[PDB]
Amino acid sequence: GLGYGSWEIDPKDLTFLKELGTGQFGVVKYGKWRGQYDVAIKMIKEGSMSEDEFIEEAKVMMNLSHEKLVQLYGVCTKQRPIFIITEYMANGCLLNYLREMRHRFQTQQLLEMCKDVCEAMEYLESKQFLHRDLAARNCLVNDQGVVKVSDFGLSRYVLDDEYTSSVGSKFPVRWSPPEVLMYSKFSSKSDIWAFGVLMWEIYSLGKMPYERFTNSETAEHIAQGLRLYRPHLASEKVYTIMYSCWHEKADERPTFKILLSNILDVMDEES
Ligand SMILES: C=CC(=O)N1CCC[C@@H](n2nc(-c3ccc(Oc4ccccc4)cc3)c3c(N)ncnc32)C1
């Protein structure tokens, strides 16, 4: 209505129902919009984000739409803290979901999680949109067990320097290819590398990549041409797919379209 741009939600239309905890960038709640639509409300703590840049980017993010990508519905920016209003994903963070041994996952379920993420990433790649921090901790799971990609591109607006540079204590070293760790060279191929590490996280039921190493040791391991090795639940064909994401030469890594074709092939062969 009057006073609101197409990317702006009126916070008065929100009903808060449940505290979900603190996610990356701030406190998140479950609620309703206009009494009946389920939403998540992510509250951005003051001083944590480059707010005007994020608001401009939110306009582009609103236009992204894919069934395996968490939908951004709008933002509430007339007050502090600002809110990010998104699709609600009842089963929460993928990393925590993988770590719950009660699920007793079949490998076909794990491969479907990989396919869900790959479809979202093929869509982002088709829009020339980099995720820049793909990992299981940045994927969500809905009430139907569908995994969707979340927090896409958001790292660009984080003000805490410990998260933003390779030399920072909170940088995603374990999901980064050699050219990012050595030279800060981000590209579609650094999202491909990260996707291979995410496939390893899924097939490992949420183990930390390079679980016995520090970040410093991981960077040395990778720079020396060494890699993660095969999770017990991954078949040789699944391992070949994730390993292809880790070629030392970025231009020899597949695209998300190729990875999708490889995953569908294994799904058919392992059906
Ligand atoms: C370890 C506990 C666990 O599960 N957590 C940790 C506590 C909060 C939980 N969480 N987070 C979101 C969410 C909400 C908004 C959002 O903004 C976007 C910004 C840019 C692009 C897309 C989204 C990102 C994630 C979220 C959600 N949507 N639905 C349910 N739980 C959520 C996940």
Side-chain angles (χ1 to χ4, degrees), residues 1-23 26-44 47-66 68-77 79 81-107 109-164 166 168 171-219 221-223 225-235 237-247 249-268 270:
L2 182 74
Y4 298 94
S6 71
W7 67 93
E8 293 178 309
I9 279 179
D10 182 348
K12 299 179 171 80
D13 285 345
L14 303 169
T15 295
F16 295 96
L17 295 176
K18 181 169 67 216
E19 301 265 34
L20 303 176
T22 63
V27 161
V28 184
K29 302 197 202 227
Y30 162 58
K32 305 284 192 169
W33 177 86
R34 296 192 179 172
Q36 62 198 127
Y37 296 98
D38 285 338
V39 295
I41 305 109
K42 176 172 269 189
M43 300 176 57
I44 306 298
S48 67
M49 177 179 286
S50 186
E51 292 176 5
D52 294 336
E53 288 178 51
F54 164 71
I55 295 163
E56 192 53 31
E57 187 68 3
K59 297 174 184 184
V60 170
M61 299 162 72
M62 285 277 290
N63 292 324
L64 294 172
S65 179
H66 187 279
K68 303 303 171 70
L69 192 69
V70 171
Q71 186 68 232
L72 169 66
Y73 296 138
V75 292
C76 306
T77 67
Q79 91 283 313
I82 72 168
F83 301 163
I84 304 178
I85 313 305
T86 75
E87 177 167 3
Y88 178 58
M89 299 293 286
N91 282 324
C93 173
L94 176 64
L95 185 57
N96 284 20
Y97 184 77
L98 288 169
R99 289 173 175 184
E100 287 166 338
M101 297 300 284
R102 61 184 171 84
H103 294 301
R104 291 171 169 82
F105 296 114
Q106 303 187 243
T107 61
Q109 290 172 276
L110 300 177
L111 192 57
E112 187 79 8
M113 298 176 197
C114 296
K115 190 164 73 66
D116 288 342
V117 172
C118 196
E119 289 172 350
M121 292 310 300
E122 183 199 22
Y123 173 79
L124 292 179
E125 187 149 79
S126 82
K127 301 304 195 185
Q128 297 179 273
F129 194 103
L130 298 192
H131 188 291
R132 281 171 166 102
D133 189 14
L134 180 64
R137 62 180 175 275
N138 290 333
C139 294
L140 292 164
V141 187
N142 73 7
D143 64 311
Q144 300 305 306
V146 179
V147 178
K148 300 189 191 200
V149 166
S150 187
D151 278 355
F152 37 94
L154 206 56
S155 66
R156 288 175 295 173
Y157 314 106
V158 172
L159 297 171
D160 181 359
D161 282 30
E162 291 313 283
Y163 283 93
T164 68
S166 301
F171 187 83
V173 170
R174 301 161 195 273
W175 289 263
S176 296
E179 69 280 0
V180 162
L181 301 174
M182 289 159 70
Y183 312 123
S184 303
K185 197 183 188 293
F186 294 87
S187 73
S188 65
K189 304 306 192 188
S190 51
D191 275 1
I192 293 289
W193 176 288
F195 175 78
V197 180
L198 174 50
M199 288 187 64
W200 185 99
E201 291 185 89
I202 287 169
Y203 277 87
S204 303
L205 306 181
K207 282 188 198 301
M208 174 79 86
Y210 318 91
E211 59 176 353
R212 297 166 180 282
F213 287 177
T214 58
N215 280 334
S216 176
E217 287 166 341
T218 294
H221 185 80
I222 288 317
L226 306 177
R227 299 299 183 250
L228 292 161
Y229 66 99
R230 182 176 165 198
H232 291 161
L233 284 166
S235 66
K237 283 169 182 80
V238 166
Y239 181 50
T240 294
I241 296 172
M242 70 182 69
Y243 197 91
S244 74
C245 296
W246 308 325
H247 201 289
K249 293 178 178 182
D251 65 14
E252 295 295 333
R253 293 177 201 143
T255 62
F256 283 110
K257 181 171 189 177
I258 293 166
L259 286 165
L260 182 59
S261 77
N262 301 155
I263 288 167
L264 288 169
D265 169 68
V266 177
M267 279 205 170
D268 287 342
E270 298 185 356

